From TrEMBL, chain A:
Keywords assigned: Hydrolase, Metal-binding, Metalloprotease, Mitochondrion, Protease, Zinc
GO biological process: proteolysis
GO molecular function, one term: metallopeptidase activity
Pfam families in alphabetical order: Peptidase_M16, Peptidase_M16_C
Coiled coil: none
InterPro entries, per the entry: Metalloenz_LuxS/M16, MPP/UQCRC_Complex, Pept_M16_N, Peptidase_M16_C
Principal cellular location given in the protein's record: mitochondrion
Name assigned to this protein: Clan ME, family M16, insulinase-like metallopeptidase
Cofactors: Zn(2+)
UniProt GO cellular component terms: mitochondrion
Record bears the keyword Acetylation: no
UniProtKB/TrEMBL annotation, chain B:
Name of the protein in its database record: Clan ME, family M16, insulinase-like metallopeptidase
InterPro entries with a match to the protein in the record: Metalloenz_LuxS/M16 (IPR011249), MPP/UQCRC_Complex (IPR050361), Peptidase_M16_C (IPR007863)
Domain Peptidase M16 C-terminal: 220-317
An example molecular function term from Gene Ontology annotations: metal ion binding
Highest rank taxon of the organism: Eukaryota
GO terms under cellular component: mitochondrion
The species this protein was found in: Trichomonas vaginalis (strain ATCC PRA-98 / G3)
Length: 415, 397
């Protein structure tokens, strides 16, 4: 657990910023958080951000693939990476003693790769495999289809890329993306730890002694305004007979940008509809027997998407949609707005205070916060804003974003 | 851990650790075996549960996270919540323990869900491995009673066990839930029943659950529903026994993996084309253990794969010093659920420092002993699918 804390940031003279937030315990999650992802790609390079992520973890100069495997098994250094539409990270969660080895492996691979035509080509099949796997989670499929028809712009690309695109990725492209996106000025070193801010700063200094400062700062290729998104609501239906007597359905609306006064309101609204689990469904859902429901709302640069999805039998499909539309409606009703605000607010508090005793979770928010925000936002000061959120705020969100808007919709059916 | 014995004889096990999320629950020696058939216990406790939380709307509105694990010999319930929801959390748990039978409408809805368990993602490959081990490796044939009904057979509410729960409940929770749980335990019967339950003895039976798997499972078009599962089971040791750290080490020596690196990965998944995965587990019971190796391959390839597991067994004799230690390394990692699971069994928790010590504190000596005594048994052989189990069996002589 943390304590409504605030991070300490020092910049090394080579321009790497070390950001640490104080934690309790013998746990430490640490790594590189990079503003690189599919939002920043075009038709010609789609998937390169994810592709590069993979290559990075396939060894460089000082730590090739074999030396990495030994470190996994024998040395207790286990390396995780992920590429979203908006960010990339490479991290390890460790025992406080492995600090020096870990900062070195992580800096070496992220900031000092050796991107060969051989590593690139070998890796291709391992990525196409990931693509086919993920194509069999229809939740992932529908999530992607919804983005694709909502956004003619880059947010509609799948993170991995189209099959076509995963095919045509050159070494020059992978190289280029590292050159333009993996520099000191487009990233943070993040540690969630009990060790003082200086033990991490000294250790990173050691790990990145090979890295020379940046000469100049050409406008960052990750800058939101180079990748303006346009939401346009669309409807599109697909077949997948293999599914049988099942259909999957997604409903989407444009969402506020991260910095919008209506961001929180939107998060409260999404949350009050929320998810259906075994024992738990929203009070706004009239038909509690609906098979499954998921709700997400994510910011993407100037834009964002709020999405509601589930599967049902062909027979119950149309019903599911009316259920969801009804539930959304009910929130705006004067008889229910106040209760919808409180329950939604509780949810958001619940969600966050649930990832405060995992240091992987703390690091991921700290990374994203620093990479994505005008300036940093703390749990406690977030909680103030959540509690200050009123009935008028919810209404104002409903006005710009829900009331009289066409929805994006995707159906994937067995008929 | 903080262990009390209440004024009325009820035990209370409290979890140590930093505040933020509240945990309460109950663990008791009633499992799937204490009802005449598969899913009887599972659907019964479920029914009681859903009723005890009043509605799903109540669970949601209070942001309460309930979890119900029904095993062969025992079960536990855990609620998780933020402190502002204490009242409802406790009251709901109190209702779960009050011994009243649930309404039949509730029970019917709950069996519907149970029949649909594979389709909804509730009956994954893990839950299948268990079943296979449990319907194959026990002398008592009532260990075959699982949590998930076959499309054919019936499910029946079992009232007896609901009256029985309060009579053998240990309460569990986070340390900040002391006074709330002491009050709760107080309202229960003095004094807990004690029953001698020992795990049933090993028997190398050869069985099939030759049943069709649903194409869609949760939200995935399953990549494995057309493949078969082979479960090979041998005896190990109870949760408590001094051998358990070496046995855990031994499981990781074997290891496993898929595609979409240890012995089962390199020898068994690499060795068999169209074998999705293989894994080894050391599974514990009230007084025993089942060491099991699980292979998900095409039905025609199981006998091949069985031979490759025998090669795997033989390779453990001459294991290099590196991996006798790398498997010590692979035993490093829902924190409350492990607290409850360990608490019932009497073992040290997987997260605790004492346990991670025990791992280093066993060498080749105690590993070899463990390998020796386990594989000197003919294996139990179960198949999810048509493959003839005796064919796989002949592989081991
Ligand atoms: Zn990947």
């Amino acid at each position: 657990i943390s304590r409504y804390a605030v991070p300490q940031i020092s910049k090394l003279s080579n321009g790497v910023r070390v950001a640490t937030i104080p934690v309790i315990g013998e746990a430490t999650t640490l790594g590189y958080w990079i503003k690189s992802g599919s939002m920043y790609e075009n038709a010609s390079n789609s998937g390169v951000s994810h592709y590069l992520q993979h290559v990075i973890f396939r060894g460089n100069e000082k730590y090739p693939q074999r030396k990495l495997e030994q470190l996994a098994e024998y040395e207790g250094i286990n390396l995780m990476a992920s590429t979203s539409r908006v960010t990339t990270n490479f991290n390890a969660t460790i025992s406080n003693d492995k600090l020096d080895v870990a900062t070195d492996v992580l800096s070496q691979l992220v900031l000092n790769p050796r991107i060969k035509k051989s590593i690139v080509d070998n890796e291709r099949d391992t990525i196409l495999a990931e693509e086919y796997e993920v194509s069999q989670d229809i939740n992932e499929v529908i999530w992607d289809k919804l983005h694709e028809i909502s956004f003619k712009t880059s947010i509609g690309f799948p993170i991995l890329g189209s099959h076509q695109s995963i095919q045509k990725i050159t070494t020059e492209m992978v190289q280029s993306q590292h050159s333009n996106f993996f520099n000191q000025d487009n990233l943070y070193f993040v540690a969630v730890t009990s060790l003082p801010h200086d033990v991490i700063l000294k250790s990173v200094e050691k790990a990145t002694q090979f890295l020379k400062p940046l000469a100049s700062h050409p406008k960052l290729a990750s800058d939101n305004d180079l990748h303006v998104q346009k939401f346009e609501p669309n409807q599109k239906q697909y077949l997948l007979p293999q599914l049988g007597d099942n259909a999957f359905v997604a409903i989407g609306f444009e969402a506020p940008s991260l910095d919008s006064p209506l961001y929180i309101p939107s998060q409260i609204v999404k949350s009050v509809i929320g998810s259906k689990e075994k024992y738990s469904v929203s009070p706004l859902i009239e038909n509690t027997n609906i098979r499954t429901l998921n709700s997400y709302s994510f910011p993407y640069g100037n834009s964002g998407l709020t999405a509601f999805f589930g599967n049902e039998s062909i027979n119950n499909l149309n019903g599911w949609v009316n259920t969801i539309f009804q539930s959304i409606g009910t929130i705006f009703s004067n008889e229910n707005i106040e209760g919808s605000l409180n329950v939604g607010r509780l949810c958001v508090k619940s969600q966050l205070a649930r990832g405060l005793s995992s240091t992987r979770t703390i690091a991921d928010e700290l990374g994203n916060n620093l990479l994505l925000r005008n300036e940093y936002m703390s749990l406690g000061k977030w909680d103030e804003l959540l509690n200050a959120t009123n009935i008028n705020n919810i209404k104002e969100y409903f006005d710009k974003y829900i009331l009289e808007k066409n929805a994006s919709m995707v159906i994937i059916s067995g008929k | 851990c903080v262990s009390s014995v209440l004024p009325n004889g009820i035990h209370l096990k409290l979890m140590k650790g930093p505040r933020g999320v509240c945990s309460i629950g109950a663990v008791f020696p009633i499992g799937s075996i204490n009802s005449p058939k598969t899913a009887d216990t599972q659907v019964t406790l479920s029914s009681k549960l859903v009723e005890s939380l009043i509605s799903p709307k109540h669970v949601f509105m209070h942001q309460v996270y309930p979890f119900l694990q029904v095993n062969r010999e025992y079960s536990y319930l855990t609620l998780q919540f933020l402190p502002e929801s204490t009242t409802y959390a406790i009251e709901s748990l109190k209702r779960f323990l009050d011994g009243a039978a649930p309404a039949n409408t509730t029970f019917d809805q709950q069996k519907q869900l149970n029949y649909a368990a594979e389709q909804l993602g509730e009956y994954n490959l893990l839950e299948k491995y268990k079943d296979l081990v449990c319907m194959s490796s026990f002398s008592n044939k009532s260990y075959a009673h699982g949590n998930y009904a076959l499309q054919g057979e019936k499910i029946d509410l079992n009232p007896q066990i609901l009256k029985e729960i309060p009579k053998c409940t240990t309460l569990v929770g986070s340390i900040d839930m002391y006074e709330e749980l002491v009050k709760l335990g107080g309202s229960l019967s003095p004094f807990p029943k004690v029953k001698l339950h020992i795990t049933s003895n090993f028997e190398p039976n050869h069985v099939n659950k030759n049943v069709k798997q649903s194409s869609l499972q949760g939200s995935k078009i399953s990549m494995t529903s057309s493949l078969s599962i082979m479960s090979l089971s041998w005896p190990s040791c109870g949760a408590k026994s001094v051998e358990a750290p070496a046995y855990a080490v031994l499981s990781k020596i074997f290891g496993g993996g898929s595609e979409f690196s240890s012995l089962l990965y390199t020898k068994v998944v690499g060795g068999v084309a169209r074998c999705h995965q293989a894994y080894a587990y050391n599974n514990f019971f009230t007084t025993g253990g089942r060491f099991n190796i699980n292979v998900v391959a095409e039905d025609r390839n199981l006998v091949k794969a069985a031979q490759l597991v025998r090669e795997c067994i033989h390779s453990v004799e001459t294991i290099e010093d590196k991996n006798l230690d790398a498997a010590r390394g692979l035993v490093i990692t829902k924190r409350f659920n492990e607290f409850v699971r360990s608490s019932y069994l009497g073992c040290k928790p997987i997260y605790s420092s004492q346990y991670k010590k025990s791992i280093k504190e066993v060498t080749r000596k105690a590993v070899e002993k463990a390998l020796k005594q386990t594989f000197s048994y003919k294996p139990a052989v179960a198949v999810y699918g048509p493959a003839v189990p005796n064919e796989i069996a002949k592989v081991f002589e």
